[PDB]
Amino acid sequence: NPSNSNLQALREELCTPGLDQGHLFEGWPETVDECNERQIALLTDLYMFSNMYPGGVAQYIRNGHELLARESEEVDFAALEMPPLIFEAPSLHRRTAERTALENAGTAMLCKTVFVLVAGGLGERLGYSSIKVSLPVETATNTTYLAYYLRWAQRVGGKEVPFVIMTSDDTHDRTLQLLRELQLEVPNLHVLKQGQVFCFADSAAHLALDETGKLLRKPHGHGDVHSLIYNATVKRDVVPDSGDGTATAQPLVNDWLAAGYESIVFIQDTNAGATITIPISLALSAEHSLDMNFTCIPRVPKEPIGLLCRTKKNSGDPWLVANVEYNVFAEVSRALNKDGGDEVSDPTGFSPFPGSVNTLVFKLSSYVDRLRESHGIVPEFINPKYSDETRRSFKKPARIESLMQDIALLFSEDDYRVGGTVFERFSYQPVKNSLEEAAGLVAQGNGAYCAATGEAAFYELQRRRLKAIGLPLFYSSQPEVTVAKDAFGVRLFPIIVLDTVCASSGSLDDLARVFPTPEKVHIDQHSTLIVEGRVIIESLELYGALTIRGPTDSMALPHVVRNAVVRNAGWSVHAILSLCAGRDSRLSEVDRIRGFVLKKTAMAVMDC
Ligand SMILES: O=c1ccn([C@@H]2O[C@H](COP(=O)(O)OP(=O)(O)O[C@H]3O[C@H](CO)[C@@H](O)[C@H](O)[C@H]3O)[C@@H](O)[C@H]2O)c(=O)[nH]1
Ligand code: VO4
Ligand SMILES: [Mg+2]
Known part of the structure; x- marks a missing residue:
């Protein structure tokens, strides 16, 4: 695809003021025709970044400057209060008429649901050297998280249930091998692999190199799932269209809507409680006409889970229902007085706002609309780890990140209803922490969220x-x-x-x-x-x-x-x-x- 003429043009472009990537070409020959194989490969890496990343490597650096400047400023929200649309879910261990009605309504809506699982993350911090969906939900049957979700989805939507799994360079091959080994037959499964992005060696967005002299790559976060879905195609045989040509570009979202599907659900890799919350969430999304529905629990003040809040970033902005990550909330909470009045704590001992467990329930039509307008692009951020409290130094190269729940701020209060459903804390059962950090967390009176507590729960x-x-x-x-x-x-x-x-x-x-x-x-x-x-x-x-x-x-x-x-x-x-x-x-x-x-x-x- 890239000619040697275009490779020189990109090299010259990246050396202009505002990009300043001359350190990548130190001691290089003046022309491209004189370059070695490794140098050609680097320019090729950079040039093909335009194909995978919006605007290519040049736009990636420009975004870095904008985000690094924003990260240096103390975050502030103009207004932060309870979201208007909050609904309390009934108990999962009480067979009330409400519980029965919500379960039976949600079970019918599961026949018309698309399922998406984000499984690109490593979590080597667990002490587990393999992929997290290969973890057993319990060791009595050793059923993997991958088989759990897939078999539930086929049971509730039929074998032809539409299913998406996002993988990464770290998890793709092992995920495909696990599917083969379990002999799972999912005709409408789509595995979409996210690409890693370049890293910044310093606060001036100078691109980082590894030990062998190649551009270091790191994850762009679970936000990549929307753009992967937007760009995914499926052929047209038994679908409404039946062309004699294999050049079919039907968008996967078009086949889903064309087939009669009305909801889409996003889940994470190690939370078995999603099979319990999802049917209730679908029923309440239909009763209360929610376009996007955050799955929430009561949050303890220091939990590493986001908070669902009604927000205004600046004084002129309209109200937005969005997730505020734990780190940002801590910075906001720890601040001098004379700023608002919604920070006072609650009597019970839970945060003023509901905690988001990132089980996202959407109306499919509304989701597709905002996906087509935005091309799946969601707002990005960067959170570098500095060496000293003085900062001005990176202990490890930083990269731009994105969150899949940050698609909520493309949903204006004018056109869309965005709300949250509050379940019992017991329904949130992730496997995130190793035994060492679980021992540390329990000493502080916090949740372990380890493999022992996941199996026991x-x-x-x-x-x-x-x-x-x-x-x-x-x-x-x-x-x-x-x-x-x-x-x-x-x-x-x-x-x-x-x-x-x-x-x-x-x-x-x-x-x-x-x-x-x-x-x-x-x-x-x-x-x-x-x-x-x-x-x-x-x-x-x-x-x-x-x-x-x-x-x-x-x-x-x-x-x-x-x-x-x-x-x-x-x-x-x-x-x-x-x-x-x-x-x-x-x-x-x-x-x-x-x-x-x-x-x-x-x-x-x-x-x-
Ligand atoms: O590049 C990436 C990064 C993450 N993930 C997936 O994202 C999910 C969650 O990642 P994890 O590191 O476990 O959680 P966080 O991203 O730190 O937190 C998320 O999950 C919390 C609940 O567990 C929520 O409270 C937060 O708002 C939400 O951002 C898992 O399925 C990962 O595999 C990917 O697929 N690719
Ligand atoms: O690749 V890191 O999330 O340890 O900066
Ligand atoms: Mg890494």
Whole structure:
């Protein structure tokens, strides 16, 4: 694509005042025709940046200057108050008429929903050297986060459900390999790989080089997902169009709208609670006519989650409903008095504003409109890490970032209704922290959000949902294992995991289909129940571990369990001892990041 003539022109352009990238060509020959292979490759990297990044590398540097200047100024909002459109979600463990009505409405709307999963991030800070969607939701079945989301989506939207996964250079190949290994068949899955962007070595936006003399690249944030969707195409065969030419440029958003889809949902890589909040969020988006709906929890004052606020940046700006990231809120909170009056704390102990967990629910028509106007471009920022409190130095090269929730400020209050739904904190179950930082956080009285608490919260979630339909689970709240040098404990048992064929959407009505007479099902607090396929359990007495397998097709007739009595040694859990020699150690990173291992001593199986 790039000729040698254009390569010299870009080189000269980047050496002009305001760009000042002469350090990249130190000791280079005057003409392009005299250049080595590596030099040609650098100019090619730079020239092809125009293709991937708006306006190319020249515009990237100019944006850097604008953002670096803005980052040097103390942030200030003209006005900051509660968003007008806030709706309290009912409890996930109470089968009220409201809960039943909202679940059944949202489950119908799931048939007309597009699903988007952002999975470009590493989180090596976890102590996990692989991709986060390969993490197990729980080690009882070892079901990955990738398989969890995909199987729920196919169950609620059918096998042909439209699904997008955003990957990065760090996660793409491993994501494709995991899809192949799980033998997942998703005909309308689109994997879109975000590109990394150049880095700034200093506050003057001088482009950074690595150890081998090539331009350092770093992530542009989860904001890239909108532009990737805007530029994505699909062919036209069984779709409304059926041309005899493969040169089809139908936008993926056009096929979705043409097929009858009315909603789009964005989720993150390690939050299993999204399958619980999404149906309620869709029902309330329809009842209250919300174009964009932020999923929120009550926030503790120092949580690393954003806040949903009604904002005005400057005195003349119209009201905007947008997310304010935790860092910005801290800077604003810590400030001299004589500025507004919405900072006083709440009696309970929660932030004045709802905390955004970044499960984003959109009306598809409104989303497409703003996507087409903006080309998926969202406002950017930069947050360099300086070496000393005096700044004027970068400990590590900085890069421009973007947030996928920052698409909310393209939604004017004049044309669009933007609101938030507030759920229980228990419904937010991310795996973000390693055991070390989880020990540090718990000492301050904060949430661990580690692999141990993520797995434990998943088992507790199943038990709360099942007790909501009348299953009589009597178990202690006392922990069964301590992790991170006895800093905190979790409990796991009783373990009850139902697959998507058994539990269907996970609605309380769907769960009542598995236990039609729950008063005659008695699962001891130390037991383990794994149910796969089309199973109905009418009466059971379980003291130990039991797997029940039914037909793998939902339309098949169901295996019905009656008057079963199963007793065995079952399972246990024990901590990974500090004196872990590691000689002939089957302990993997998966075990080590949660601090315990399940011992699967006995297991009964009911087949057919
Ligand atoms: O280049 C990137 C960066 C991030 N991600 C994905 O973004 C999600 C969240 O990233 P993470 O580092 O876990 O969270 P933050 O970006 O720090 O915070 C987000 O998630 C919080 C809730 O977990 C919200 O409160 C914040 O507002 C929101 O910005 C994950 O699925 C990542 O894989 C990508 O796909 N690509
Ligand atoms: O690549 V960093 O998010 O450690 O600056
Ligand atoms: Mg990096």
